[PDB]
Every structure is written in C-alpha cells, then in structure tokens.
Design a protein around this ligand. Sequence first.
Ligand code: HEC
Ligand code: NA
Length: 88
Amino acid sequence: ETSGEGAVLFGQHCAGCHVNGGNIIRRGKNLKLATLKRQGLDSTEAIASIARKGIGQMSGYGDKLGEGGDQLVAGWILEQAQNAWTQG
Ligand code: HEC
Ligand code: NA
C-alpha cells in the first residue's frame, strides 16, 4: 500500500550485495528472472522466504525487515526481475 516501502527495504538490507539485480558474492546467484526461474524462485513467496531465512551462503534478514517486510521487498525484486532491472 505504501509507495516505495519494498524498494527502501531493498536499499537498506539487500542492495549492498544485489544492486541492479546482481550478486557481488556468488555472481551466478543473481536476481535476474531467468536465474530465479531456473531454480524455481520466480515468485514473491520464494524470494520472501530467502529474504526471511537466507539460503546457502546468504543469511536471513527477517529479524530486520519488519512484519511482512520479506513480502514487500520480494514483490519489488520480482517486478524488477520482470523488467530486467531497467526502466525508462
Ligand atoms: C551479501 C552479504 C548479501 C546480502 C546483503 C543479501 N544477499 Fe541475497 N544472496 C547472497 C548470496 C551469497 C546468495 C547465494 C546463496 C547461495 O549459496 O546460493 C544470495 C542469494 C539470494 C537469492 C537467490 C538468488 C539465486 O538463486 O539466483 C535471493 C532471492 C536473494 N539473495 C535475496 C535477497 C534479499 C531479498 C536480500 C535483502 C533482504 C538479500 N538477498 C541480501 C548474498 C546477499
Ligand atoms: Na527493462
């Protein structure tokens, strides 16, 4: 409901590793749609789960995102992925 809330969470907690849909730690484990889709992760729910609890080399951020923040940041990331991380 609040404009930008997911994007602001992304900047606060995720951009340091994932700005512009990349991954500065494991390059292949990026946030491009094809990369997420290959792993079955191209949904708000899957991304939210990773946001909350982490996966593999990544820790969780659910302790910092606020109630429902995992879903908010996930929805923003999915939109970006769908747009190939560029807008006009
Ligand atoms: C660097 C310290 C990171 C921060 C901050 C965040 N993530 Fe991350 N992410 C990181 C790594 C090293 C990996 C790969 C983990 C592995 O071993 O497989 C990931 C992965 C993701 C994914 C999956 C991407 C893929 O499989 O292609 C998602 C969806 C993801 N990360 C989301 C995400 C969010 C929402 C974050 C902020 C809440 C976040 N990450 C921060 C490293 C880092
Ligand atoms: Na685009």
